[PDB]
């Protein structure tokens, strides 16, 4: 049952990551991430992908993103993190909340998500949906992630480096006009990466 819907959310990630390069477009290029996007097939909004090395072994980085203590003391953008319930191979109910982004444009969201972390290849995923959940917090706007996830795979020239390529399909719903959602999804990228880099 969460094993099968464990099995179709991989499988989901798997398809995003051979989705091939003519169907992306670039959208941020700085020094060491790339960043495109393409039309999401869940919501009228963007499924965005991003790809960049980081100097360290996969099991680390990923022991780093899963849900967890780590993730949210290294992660500038999250405030909270909770894990409501574990399961079996490596999955888990987590809900989180992020700071207010641009100057509270975008107040504070809470995300409640189903993720599952899994071999692939000689690496790993760690892949995620947001989850119906019925609690409401009324000083949080429930954002929904839709399936979403980071593949971690050791470096073609150096196997102690890794490449590390996310699949990011955030609503974060309420009413923010679209230079903001662009805005805030770029530097949730970008800062990801930073301060994920800077942890190692």
């Given at each position: 049952d969460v094993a099968s819907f464990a099995t179709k959310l991989k499988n989901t990630l798997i398809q995003y990551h051979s989705?091939?390069?003519?169907?992306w477009r670039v959208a941020k290029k700085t020094k060491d991430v790339t960043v495109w996007r393409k039309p999401s097939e869940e919501f009228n909004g963007y499924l965005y992908k991003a790809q960049g090395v980081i100097d360290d072994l996969v099991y680390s980085i990923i022991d780093h993103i899963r849900p967890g203590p780590s993730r949210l003391d290294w992660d500038?953008?999250?405030?909270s993190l909770d894990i409501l319930e574990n399961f079996e191979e490596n999955c888990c109910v987590m809900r989180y909340t992020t700071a207010g982004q641009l100057w509270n444009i975008i107040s504070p969201r809470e995300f409640v998500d189903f993720s599952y972390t899994v071999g692939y290849k000689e690496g790993l995923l760690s892949c995620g949906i947001s989850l119906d959940w019925?609690?409401?917090?009324?000083?949080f706007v429930r954002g929904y992630n839709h399936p979403c996830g980071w593949f971690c795979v050791p470096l073609?020239?150096?196997?102690n480096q890794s490449l590390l390529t996310g699949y990011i399909q955030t609503?974060?719903?309420?009413?923010?006009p679209q230079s903001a959602v662009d805005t805030a999804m770029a530097s949730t990228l970008t800062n990801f990466y930073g301060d994920l880099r800077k942890a190692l």
């Open positions: 989705i091939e390069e003519d169907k500038s953008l999250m405030t019925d609690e409401k917090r009324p000083e073609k020239d150096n196997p609503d974060l719903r309420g009413m923010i």
